[PDB]
């Protein structure tokens, strides 16, 4: 596998979004992964509607601003036969009744793939598929104030994840401790957070923060 991967430079990744004060991280992770796979297939990068997922994917098991799962989101798009664009169905940061309109659908999928729970298996997926939806333990003050460098939190759990994000690559940089590898992760907390909305998460460090514990992507 490659030593460094960045799908943003290949055109797979839309700009950083902001979920506001709604527990909809799962919807942004899922649209991010489906935005990448749709571009892989059509060569067109179109931002997808998280509000569509928040409002409409309850029958698949999601609960709006109170949480959800990326796999449930991919199942909705398959069961529903489409997903509306961000411009047609914009984000309001609040759960409402479903307003899906197939005329404005711009995405489809035919299921999803669950990656084995090993950082080695994740590395392979990122290297060959595109951006990957993942879950992490983001519940630590150090994650809120992250600015730069490789993030490592000694009391992060790898069993208890609470936040869905998007791995868009991986790489390295020399560090004091010689733990130099990282996952490149796109968040949904706006541009102001982290490094332009991104974070470098420690890689090959005992599945840090559970990044490899619930990874998946849609099949288009
Ligand atoms: C991210 O914004 C969100 C925060 C949650 C929801 C409101 N309070 C929170 O702490 N995280 C999730 O939605 C999270 C993402 C996973 C990929 C880790 N999932 C979640 O909280 O799921 C709860 C749930 C489990 C099973 C079925 C339905 C809901
Ligand atoms: Na924790």
Author numbering: 1 to 220
The article reads:
Several drug screening campaigns identified Calpeptin as a drug candidate against SARS-CoV-2. Here, we have further investigated a potential dual-targeting effect of Calpeptin and, indeed, show the pico-molar inhibition of cathepsins by Calpeptin, its sulfonated prodrug analog S-Calpeptin, and the chemically similar prodrug GC-376. Binding of the activated compounds to Mpro, CatL, CatK, and CatV was characterized by X-ray crystallography and their antiviral activity against SARS-CoV-2 was confirmed in cellular infection assays. All three compounds bind in a highly similar manner to the catalytic site of each protease.
Calpeptin and GC-376 differ in the replacement of norleucine in Calpeptin with a 2-oxopyrrolidine side chain in GC-376. The catalytic dyad of the active site are Cys25 in the L-domain and His163 in the R-domain. Both Calpeptin and the GC-376 aldehyde bind covalently via the aldehyde group to Cys25, forming a thiohemiacetal, exhibiting the same binding mode. The three amino acid analogs of these peptidomimetic inhibitors occupy the substrate sites S1 to S3. The main interactions of Calpeptin and the GC-376 aldehyde are mediated by the peptide backbone forming hydrogen bonds to the CatL main chain residues Gly68 and Asp162 in a substrate-like manner. In addition, the thiohemiacetal oxygen forms a hydrogen bond to Gln19. In the Calpeptin structure the norleucine side chain forms hydrophobic contacts to Gly23 and Asn66. The analog 2-oxopyrrolidine group of GC-376 shows also hydrophobic interactions with these residues. The central leucine side chains of both compounds are covered in the hydrophobic S2-pocket formed by Leu69, Met70 and Ala135. In both structures the terminal Cbz-group is located at the S3 position. For GC-376, slightly weaker inhibition was found (91 pM and 259 pM).
